[PDB]
Amino acid sequence: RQRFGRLELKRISGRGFKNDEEILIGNGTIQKIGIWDGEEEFHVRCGECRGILKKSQMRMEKLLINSAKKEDMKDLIILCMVFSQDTRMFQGVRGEINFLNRAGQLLSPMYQLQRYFLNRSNDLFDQWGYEESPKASELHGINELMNASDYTLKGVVVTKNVD
Ligand SMILES: Nc1nc2c(ncn2[C@@H]2O[C@H](COP(=O)(O)OP(=O)(O)OP(=O)(O)O)[C@@H](O)[C@H]2O)c(=O)[nH]1
């Protein structure tokens, strides 16, 4: 099991293979990043929100989460978008990613990105895009307010709390 900031993950399936790549991100800077290749699925948790994450190389394919405190839902979605290394997430960077840690050093790129988008989720969501919500009975779409809606952040769905 693994941790990516407040994101907690447990592998469900697949294997990732990391390759160092130079990535040209949205603010016109080149970052060196271990890019994970391959299909992978993870149980994911952030605080009280739990879900299933499906990803492939630089692509979040699907994110299924439960209803929870909105701040936990939103952070889970963002952390999953960053963790999946989605190209839309890389392209969403506008500002600088030059955060210093409590030690005077630059955070590593993936941790810059996590810190950046948790701070500027609109830069991510505007870049990410919306699509028609699934109409499968047990799922609904979710907008940037973490409200159920007819449109959803692409690839994200929420389960209803049903007894
Ligand atoms: N897609 C994918 N990402 C992983 C996997 N394992 C670790 N990561 C992520 O890849 C990055 C590098 O993590 P590691 O190789 O485990 O170790 P690290 O380079 O010291 O980085 P940290 O452990 O996060 O401090 C981290 O952001 C992890 O979240 C994996 O199996 N699949």
Swiss-Prot record:
<comment type="function">
    <text>Plays an essential role in transcription initiation and cap-stealing mechanism, in which cellular capped pre-mRNAs are used to generate primers for viral transcription. Recognizes and binds a wide range of cap structures of target pre-RNAs which are subsequently cleaved after 10-13 nucleotides by the viral protein PA. Plays a role in the initiation of the viral genome replication and modulates the activity of the ribonucleoprotein (RNP) complex.</text>
</comment>
<protein>
    <recommendedName>
        <fullName>Polymerase basic protein 2</fullName>
    </recommendedName>
</protein>
<comment type="similarity">
    <text>Belongs to the influenza viruses PB2 family.</text>
</comment>
<comment type="subunit">
    <text>Influenza RNA polymerase is composed of three subunits: PB1, PB2 and PA. Interacts (via N-terminus) with PB1 (via C-terminus). Interacts with nucleoprotein NP (via N-terminus). Interacts with host ANP32A (via C-terminus) and ANP32B; these interactions promote viral RNA synthesis.</text>
</comment>
